[PDB]
Protein backbone atom coordinates (compact mmCIF):
# COMPACT_ATOMS: atom_id res chain seq x y z
CA UNK A 1 0.00 0.00 0.00
CA UNK A 2 1.70 3.17 -1.25
CA UNK A 3 -0.69 5.82 -2.61
CA UNK A 4 -3.24 7.28 -0.20
CA UNK A 5 -5.77 10.10 -0.35
CA UNK A 6 -4.84 13.39 1.40
CA UNK A 7 -7.39 13.61 4.20
CA UNK A 8 -4.99 15.34 6.59
CA UNK A 9 -4.97 18.42 4.34
CA UNK A 10 -8.71 18.93 4.75
CA UNK A 11 -9.00 17.93 8.43
CA UNK A 12 -5.70 19.47 9.60
CA UNK A 13 -5.13 22.84 7.96
CA UNK A 14 -3.41 25.81 9.57
CA UNK A 15 -6.62 27.82 9.14
CA UNK A 16 -9.91 27.02 7.42
CA UNK A 17 -11.91 29.29 5.11
CA UNK A 18 -14.87 31.56 5.75
CA UNK A 19 -18.36 30.13 5.41
CA UNK A 20 -19.48 32.36 2.55
CA UNK A 21 -16.48 31.67 0.28
CA UNK A 22 -15.94 28.03 1.21
CA UNK A 23 -13.67 25.28 -0.12
CA UNK A 24 -14.48 22.26 -2.24
CA UNK A 25 -11.91 19.52 -2.79
CA UNK A 26 -12.09 16.74 -5.37
CA UNK A 27 -10.47 13.45 -4.33
CA UNK A 28 -9.92 10.67 -6.86
CA UNK A 29 -7.42 8.02 -7.97
CA UNK A 30 -6.13 7.12 -4.51
CA UNK A 31 -6.62 4.70 -1.62
CA UNK A 32 -8.83 6.08 1.16
CA UNK A 33 -8.52 4.65 4.67
CA UNK A 34 -11.05 6.18 7.06
CA UNK A 35 -9.39 4.95 10.27
CA UNK A 36 -7.12 8.02 10.31
CA UNK A 37 -10.17 10.29 10.71
CA UNK A 38 -10.42 9.49 14.44
CA UNK A 39 -7.37 11.62 15.27
CA UNK A 40 -9.90 14.22 16.45
CA UNK A 41 -11.38 11.90 19.06
CA UNK A 42 -13.87 14.45 20.54
CA UNK A 43 -16.09 14.50 17.46
CA UNK A 44 -18.98 16.78 18.39
CA UNK A 45 -21.12 15.63 15.44
CA UNK A 46 -20.83 12.67 13.10
CA UNK A 47 -24.11 12.70 11.15
CA UNK A 48 -24.01 10.29 8.20
CA UNK A 49 -26.86 10.23 5.68
CA UNK A 50 -27.54 7.46 3.18
CA UNK A 51 -24.47 5.44 4.19
CA UNK A 52 -23.28 3.32 7.10
CA UNK A 53 -21.06 5.46 9.39
CA UNK A 54 -18.64 2.52 9.78
CA UNK A 55 -18.49 0.42 6.59
CA UNK A 56 -17.06 3.24 4.51
CA UNK A 57 -14.23 0.98 3.31
CA UNK A 58 -16.69 -1.47 1.74
CA UNK A 59 -17.60 0.37 -1.47
CA UNK A 60 -15.52 1.85 -4.28
CA UNK A 61 -16.59 5.30 -5.47
CA UNK A 62 -15.86 7.30 -8.61
CA UNK A 63 -14.86 10.37 -6.59
CA UNK A 64 -15.52 12.02 -3.23
CA UNK A 65 -15.86 15.71 -2.34
CA UNK A 66 -14.85 17.46 0.88
CA UNK A 67 -16.58 20.73 1.79
CA UNK A 68 -15.09 22.57 4.77
CA UNK A 69 -16.19 25.80 6.44
CA UNK A 70 -16.09 27.53 9.84
CA UNK A 71 -19.29 28.67 11.55
CA UNK A 72 -20.61 29.46 15.02
CA UNK A 73 -21.33 26.48 17.25
CA UNK A 74 -24.99 27.52 17.55
CA UNK A 75 -25.60 26.98 13.82
CA UNK A 76 -24.22 23.48 13.09
CA UNK A 77 -27.87 22.40 13.17
CA UNK A 78 -28.36 24.02 9.75
CA UNK A 79 -26.02 21.53 8.04
CA UNK A 80 -28.75 19.05 7.08
CA UNK A 81 -31.15 18.53 4.15
CA UNK A 82 -34.36 20.53 4.16
CA UNK A 83 -33.18 23.11 6.70
CA UNK A 84 -33.81 26.85 6.91
CA UNK A 85 -31.86 29.57 8.67
CA UNK A 86 -29.36 32.35 8.26
CA UNK A 87 -26.65 30.13 6.77
CA UNK A 88 -28.84 27.72 4.80
CA UNK A 89 -30.41 30.64 2.92
CA UNK A 90 -27.43 32.87 2.14
CA UNK A 91 -24.11 31.12 2.87
CA UNK A 92 -24.24 27.36 2.18
CA UNK A 93 -26.94 24.79 1.50
CA UNK A 94 -27.27 21.01 1.29
CA UNK A 95 -29.45 19.24 -1.30
CA UNK A 96 -32.85 17.91 -0.28
CA UNK A 97 -31.35 14.43 -0.66
CA UNK A 98 -27.84 13.60 0.54
CA UNK A 99 -25.22 10.88 0.87
CA UNK A 100 -22.04 10.80 2.93
CA UNK A 101 -21.20 12.21 6.35
CA UNK A 102 -20.97 15.49 8.27
CA UNK A 103 -18.19 15.97 10.84
CA UNK A 104 -17.87 18.83 13.34
CA UNK A 105 -15.43 19.53 16.17
CA UNK A 106 -14.84 22.54 18.40
CA UNK A 107 -11.76 24.69 17.78
CA UNK A 108 -12.00 27.24 20.58
CA UNK A 109 -8.28 26.92 21.37
CA UNK A 110 -7.15 27.74 17.81
CA UNK A 111 -9.49 30.43 16.42
CA UNK A 112 -10.68 32.56 19.33
CA UNK A 113 -8.03 35.01 20.53
CA UNK A 114 -7.93 37.93 22.93
CA UNK A 115 -8.95 41.21 21.34
CA UNK A 116 -11.40 39.47 19.01
CA UNK A 117 -10.76 37.36 15.91
CA UNK A 118 -11.94 39.28 12.84
CA UNK A 119 -10.87 36.95 10.03
CA UNK A 120 -14.05 34.87 9.56
CA UNK A 121 -17.06 36.57 7.98
CA UNK A 122 -20.56 35.76 6.75
CA UNK A 123 -23.24 37.26 4.52
CA UNK A 124 -26.21 39.09 6.01
CA UNK A 125 -28.74 39.36 3.19
CA UNK A 126 -29.35 38.81 -0.51
CA UNK A 127 -32.22 39.01 -2.97
CA UNK A 128 -32.64 35.25 -3.53
CA UNK A 129 -31.69 32.15 -1.58
CA UNK A 130 -28.55 30.18 -2.36
CA UNK A 131 -28.81 27.01 -4.42
CA UNK A 132 -27.47 23.63 -3.33
CA UNK A 133 -23.68 23.76 -3.74
CA UNK A 134 -23.75 27.36 -5.00
CA UNK A 135 -21.06 29.85 -4.01
CA UNK A 136 -21.34 33.64 -4.19
CA UNK A 137 -18.52 36.06 -3.35
CA UNK A 138 -19.96 39.26 -4.82
CA UNK A 139 -19.71 42.20 -2.41
CA UNK A 140 -21.69 45.17 -3.75
CA UNK A 141 -23.24 47.86 -1.56
CA UNK A 142 -27.04 47.61 -1.63
CA UNK A 143 -28.66 51.02 -2.13
CA UNK A 144 -32.04 51.47 -0.44
CA UNK A 145 -32.22 55.25 -0.13
CA UNK A 146 -32.81 57.64 -3.00
CA UNK A 147 -29.24 58.96 -3.03
CA UNK A 148 -26.50 56.74 -4.49
CA UNK A 149 -23.77 55.17 -2.38
CA UNK A 150 -20.82 55.36 -4.82
CA UNK A 151 -18.92 52.60 -3.06
CA UNK A 152 -19.23 54.10 0.43
CA UNK A 153 -21.27 52.42 3.16
CA UNK A 154 -23.50 54.57 5.34
CA UNK A 155 -27.15 55.24 6.11
CA UNK A 156 -29.33 53.40 3.57
CA UNK A 157 -26.12 51.95 2.07
CA UNK A 158 -25.37 48.55 3.59
CA UNK A 159 -22.32 46.30 3.29
CA UNK A 160 -23.49 42.66 3.10
CA UNK A 161 -20.78 41.02 5.25
CA UNK A 162 -20.20 40.90 9.01
CA UNK A 163 -17.35 39.23 10.88
CA UNK A 164 -17.89 36.75 13.70
CA UNK A 165 -16.75 38.04 17.07
CA UNK A 166 -14.54 35.27 18.44
CA UNK A 167 -12.96 35.67 21.89
CA UNK A 168 -11.91 33.05 24.46
CA UNK A 169 -14.53 34.26 26.97
CA UNK A 170 -17.74 33.02 25.34
CA UNK A 171 -20.44 30.44 25.92
CA UNK A 172 -20.86 26.99 24.42
CA UNK A 173 -22.52 28.77 21.53
CA UNK A 174 -20.82 31.69 19.79
CA UNK A 175 -17.55 29.71 19.79
CA UNK A 176 -15.76 28.68 16.58
CA UNK A 177 -16.51 25.29 15.05
CA UNK A 178 -15.01 23.45 12.08
CA UNK A 179 -17.08 21.41 9.63
CA UNK A 180 -16.23 18.81 6.98
CA UNK A 181 -18.85 17.28 4.68
CA UNK A 182 -18.05 14.11 2.74
CA UNK A 183 -20.14 13.42 -0.37
CA UNK A 184 -19.74 10.00 -1.96
CA UNK A 185 -20.53 9.61 -5.66
CA UNK A 186 -20.43 6.94 -8.37
CA UNK A 187 -21.41 7.61 -12.00
CA UNK A 188 -20.61 5.57 -15.12
CA UNK A 189 -16.83 6.02 -15.02
CA UNK A 190 -14.78 3.29 -13.32
CA UNK A 191 -14.52 3.63 -9.55
CA UNK A 192 -11.01 4.56 -8.40
CA UNK A 193 -11.57 5.37 -4.71
CA UNK A 194 -11.85 2.75 -1.96
CA UNK A 195 -10.03 1.25 0.98
CA UNK A 196 -6.75 -0.63 1.26
CA UNK A 197 -6.31 -4.39 1.04
Amino acid sequence: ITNLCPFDEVFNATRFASVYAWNRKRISNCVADYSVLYNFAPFFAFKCYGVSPTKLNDLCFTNVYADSFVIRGNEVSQIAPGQTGNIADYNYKLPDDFTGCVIAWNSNKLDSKVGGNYNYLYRLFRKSNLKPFERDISTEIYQAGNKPCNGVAGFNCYFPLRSYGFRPTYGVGHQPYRVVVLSFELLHAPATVCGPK
Partner: antibody
Amino acid sequence: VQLVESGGGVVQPGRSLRLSCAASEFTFSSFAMHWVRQAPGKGLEWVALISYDGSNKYYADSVKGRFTISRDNSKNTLYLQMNSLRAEDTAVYYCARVSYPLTKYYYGMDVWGQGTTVTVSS
Amino acid sequence: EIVMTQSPAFMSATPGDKVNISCKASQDIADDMNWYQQKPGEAAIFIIQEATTLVPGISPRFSGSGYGTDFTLTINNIESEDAAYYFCLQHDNFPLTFGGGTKVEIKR
Protein backbone atom coordinates in the same frame (compact mmCIF):
# COMPACT_ATOMS: atom_id res chain seq x y z
CA VAL B 1 -36.74 58.76 5.57
CA GLN B 2 -40.03 59.26 7.40
CA LEU B 3 -42.90 57.29 8.92
CA VAL B 4 -46.38 58.70 9.57
CA GLU B 5 -49.19 57.00 11.50
CA SER B 6 -52.86 57.91 11.23
CA GLY B 7 -56.33 56.54 11.89
CA GLY B 8 -56.47 56.79 15.68
CA GLY B 9 -59.42 57.97 17.70
CA VAL B 10 -62.05 57.07 20.25
CA VAL B 11 -64.06 53.86 19.83
CA GLN B 12 -66.62 52.04 21.97
CA PRO B 13 -65.63 48.69 23.52
CA GLY B 14 -66.19 45.64 21.35
CA ARG B 15 -65.90 47.50 18.03
CA SER B 16 -63.21 47.60 15.34
CA LEU B 17 -60.70 50.09 13.96
CA ARG B 18 -57.88 50.27 11.41
CA LEU B 19 -54.56 52.11 11.59
CA SER B 20 -52.31 52.87 8.63
CA CYS B 21 -48.57 53.59 8.59
CA ALA B 22 -47.05 55.37 5.59
CA ALA B 23 -43.39 55.14 4.57
CA SER B 24 -41.46 57.30 2.12
CA GLU B 25 -37.99 58.18 0.75
CA PHE B 26 -36.96 54.51 0.93
CA THR B 27 -37.79 51.14 -0.60
CA PHE B 28 -40.73 49.99 1.51
CA SER B 29 -40.90 46.61 -0.24
CA SER B 30 -37.54 45.34 1.08
CA PHE B 31 -37.98 45.90 4.84
CA ALA B 32 -39.79 44.19 7.70
CA MET B 33 -42.02 46.26 9.98
CA HIS B 34 -42.95 46.32 13.66
CA TRP B 35 -46.08 47.48 15.47
CA VAL B 36 -45.40 48.52 19.08
CA ARG B 37 -47.54 50.15 21.75
CA GLN B 38 -47.08 51.99 25.04
CA ALA B 39 -49.85 52.12 27.63
CA PRO B 40 -50.16 55.24 29.83
CA GLY B 41 -47.84 55.06 32.81
CA LYS B 42 -46.25 51.81 31.61
CA GLY B 43 -43.25 50.69 29.61
CA LEU B 44 -43.36 49.89 25.92
CA GLU B 45 -44.80 46.58 24.75
CA TRP B 46 -44.14 44.76 21.48
CA VAL B 47 -47.28 43.91 19.48
CA ALA B 48 -46.67 42.54 15.98
CA LEU B 49 -44.13 41.85 13.24
CA ILE B 50 -44.48 41.45 9.47
CA SER B 51 -41.81 40.41 6.97
CA TYR B 52 -40.85 42.19 3.75
CA ASP B 53 -42.76 39.73 1.55
CA GLY B 54 -45.75 39.24 3.86
CA SER B 55 -45.65 35.47 4.39
CA ASN B 56 -44.27 35.59 7.94
CA LYS B 57 -46.41 37.27 10.61
CA TYR B 58 -45.74 37.26 14.35
CA TYR B 59 -48.15 38.34 17.09
CA ALA B 60 -47.89 38.82 20.82
CA ASP B 61 -49.83 36.41 23.02
CA SER B 62 -52.05 39.09 24.56
CA VAL B 63 -53.23 40.27 21.12
CA LYS B 64 -53.55 36.91 19.34
CA GLY B 65 -56.75 36.24 17.42
CA ARG B 66 -57.94 39.86 17.43
CA PHE B 67 -55.32 41.96 15.59
CA THR B 68 -54.40 41.50 11.92
CA ILE B 69 -51.29 42.97 10.29
CA SER B 70 -50.93 43.51 6.55
CA ARG B 71 -49.04 45.58 4.01
CA ASP B 72 -49.40 47.06 0.53
CA ASN B 73 -46.09 47.50 -1.29
CA SER B 74 -47.59 49.34 -4.27
CA LYS B 75 -49.15 52.01 -2.04
CA ASN B 76 -46.25 51.86 0.47
CA THR B 77 -48.63 51.31 3.39
CA LEU B 78 -48.83 49.17 6.53
CA TYR B 79 -52.21 48.29 8.03
CA LEU B 80 -53.25 47.06 11.48
CA GLN B 81 -56.86 45.96 11.99
CA MET B 82 -58.18 45.72 15.56
CA ASN B 83 -61.36 43.84 16.46
CA SER B 84 -63.19 43.24 19.75
CA LEU B 85 -61.32 46.05 21.47
CA ARG B 86 -61.29 45.98 25.27
CA ALA B 87 -60.30 48.22 28.17
CA GLU B 88 -56.55 47.50 28.08
CA ASP B 89 -56.07 48.56 24.43
CA THR B 90 -55.83 52.28 25.27
CA ALA B 91 -52.23 53.20 24.45
CA VAL B 92 -50.00 54.98 21.92
CA TYR B 93 -49.13 52.96 18.82
CA TYR B 94 -45.77 53.15 17.04
CA CYS B 95 -44.72 51.95 13.58
CA ALA B 96 -41.08 50.87 13.32
CA ARG B 97 -38.75 49.64 10.58
CA VAL B 98 -36.23 46.79 10.76
CA SER B 99 -32.60 47.87 10.38
CA TYR B 100 -31.51 45.52 7.65
CA PRO B 101 -33.07 44.93 4.22
CA LEU B 102 -33.87 41.59 2.58
CA THR B 103 -33.32 39.77 5.88
CA LYS B 104 -35.66 37.46 7.80
CA TYR B 105 -33.60 36.68 10.92
CA TYR B 106 -32.59 40.02 12.50
CA TYR B 107 -35.64 41.61 14.20
CA GLY B 108 -33.91 44.92 14.96
CA MET B 109 -35.57 48.33 14.60
CA ASP B 110 -33.89 51.68 13.96
CA VAL B 111 -36.52 54.11 12.62
CA TRP B 112 -39.68 54.98 14.56
CA GLY B 113 -42.73 57.17 14.03
CA GLN B 114 -44.61 59.91 15.84
CA GLY B 115 -47.46 57.63 16.92
CA THR B 116 -51.24 57.74 17.27
CA THR B 117 -53.59 57.51 20.24
CA VAL B 118 -56.46 55.02 20.54
CA THR B 119 -59.03 55.47 23.31
CA VAL B 120 -61.46 52.71 24.28
CA SER B 121 -64.33 54.50 26.03
CA SER B 122 -68.12 54.72 25.79
CA GLU C 1 -40.09 35.73 27.99
CA ILE C 2 -36.96 37.56 29.15
CA VAL C 3 -37.63 40.17 31.83
CA MET C 4 -35.40 43.21 31.25
CA THR C 5 -34.79 45.52 34.22
CA GLN C 6 -33.55 49.10 33.86
CA SER C 7 -32.17 51.23 36.69
CA PRO C 8 -32.55 53.86 37.93
CA ALA C 9 -36.08 54.96 36.99
CA PHE C 10 -35.38 58.62 37.83
CA MET C 11 -32.26 60.70 38.40
CA SER C 12 -30.95 64.24 38.69
CA ALA C 13 -28.04 65.32 36.49
CA THR C 14 -25.51 68.02 37.30
CA PRO C 15 -24.31 70.23 34.43
CA GLY C 16 -21.12 68.15 34.42
CA ASP C 17 -20.12 64.68 35.66
CA LYS C 18 -20.87 61.27 34.14
CA VAL C 19 -23.98 59.09 34.45
CA ASN C 20 -24.31 55.31 34.23
CA ILE C 21 -27.58 53.49 33.47
CA SER C 22 -27.81 49.75 34.11
CA CYS C 23 -29.84 47.30 32.01
CA LYS C 24 -30.03 43.73 33.21
CA ALA C 25 -31.40 40.53 31.74
CA SER C 26 -32.79 37.42 33.42
CA GLN C 27 -31.12 35.15 30.82
CA ASP C 28 -27.96 35.18 28.71
CA ILE C 29 -28.44 37.18 25.50
CA ALA C 30 -24.83 37.98 24.45
CA ASP C 31 -24.69 41.33 22.59
CA ASP C 32 -28.29 41.38 21.35
CA MET C 33 -29.49 44.76 22.61
CA ASN C 34 -29.94 48.36 21.49
CA TRP C 35 -30.13 51.68 23.34
CA TYR C 36 -32.67 54.31 22.26
CA GLN C 37 -33.32 57.94 23.20
CA GLN C 38 -36.72 59.63 22.86
CA LYS C 39 -37.36 63.28 23.63
CA PRO C 40 -40.93 64.20 24.64
CA GLY C 41 -43.03 64.94 21.56
CA GLU C 42 -40.61 63.58 18.94
CA ALA C 43 -39.76 60.15 17.59
CA ALA C 44 -37.22 57.83 19.18
CA ILE C 45 -33.57 58.08 18.13
CA PHE C 46 -31.33 55.09 17.38
CA ILE C 47 -28.34 55.60 19.66
CA ILE C 48 -26.46 52.38 20.34
CA GLN C 49 -26.39 49.14 18.35
CA GLU C 50 -25.24 45.76 19.72
CA ALA C 51 -24.36 47.29 23.11
CA THR C 52 -20.89 48.38 21.99
CA THR C 53 -21.07 49.95 18.53
CA LEU C 54 -21.71 53.69 18.38
CA VAL C 55 -24.15 54.69 15.65
CA PRO C 56 -22.66 57.18 13.15
CA GLY C 57 -23.98 60.71 13.45
CA ILE C 58 -24.29 60.69 17.25
CA SER C 59 -22.00 62.60 19.59
CA PRO C 60 -19.02 60.56 20.86
CA ARG C 61 -19.96 61.39 24.46
CA PHE C 62 -22.37 58.44 24.57
CA SER C 63 -20.85 55.02 25.20
CA GLY C 64 -21.98 51.50 25.99
CA SER C 65 -20.45 48.40 27.51
CA GLY C 66 -21.33 44.97 28.83
CA TYR C 67 -21.60 41.36 27.70
CA GLY C 68 -23.73 38.57 29.12
CA THR C 69 -26.56 39.80 31.33
CA ASP C 70 -25.35 43.17 32.66
CA PHE C 71 -25.02 46.22 30.41
CA THR C 72 -24.17 49.85 31.07
CA LEU C 73 -24.86 53.07 29.17
CA THR C 74 -22.49 55.92 30.01
CA ILE C 75 -23.09 59.62 29.31
CA ASN C 76 -20.14 61.94 29.87
CA ASN C 77 -19.99 65.75 29.79
CA ILE C 78 -23.73 66.24 30.17
CA GLU C 79 -25.40 69.27 28.59
CA SER C 80 -28.86 70.79 28.91
CA GLU C 81 -30.27 69.05 25.82
CA ASP C 82 -29.40 65.59 27.18
CA ALA C 83 -32.70 65.36 29.09
CA ALA C 84 -34.79 62.65 27.44
CA TYR C 85 -36.23 59.14 27.86
CA TYR C 86 -33.64 56.36 27.52
CA PHE C 87 -34.66 52.73 27.06
CA CYS C 88 -32.87 49.45 26.37
CA LEU C 89 -34.33 46.82 24.02
CA GLN C 90 -33.39 43.18 23.47
CA HIS C 91 -34.05 41.40 20.16
CA ASP C 92 -32.72 37.90 20.79
CA ASN C 93 -35.83 35.70 20.93
CA PHE C 94 -39.56 36.21 20.66
CA PRO C 95 -41.32 37.97 22.16
CA LEU C 96 -39.19 41.11 22.03
CA THR C 97 -39.11 42.88 25.40
CA PHE C 98 -38.09 46.45 26.18
CA GLY C 99 -36.52 47.74 29.38
CA GLY C 100 -38.19 49.97 31.92
CA GLY C 101 -37.65 53.71 31.81
CA THR C 102 -35.23 56.46 32.71
CA LYS C 103 -35.73 60.23 32.85
CA VAL C 104 -32.71 62.52 33.18
CA GLU C 105 -33.17 66.06 34.50
CA ILE C 106 -30.66 68.90 34.77
CA LYS C 107 -29.99 70.00 38.35
CA ARG C 108 -29.66 73.65 39.40
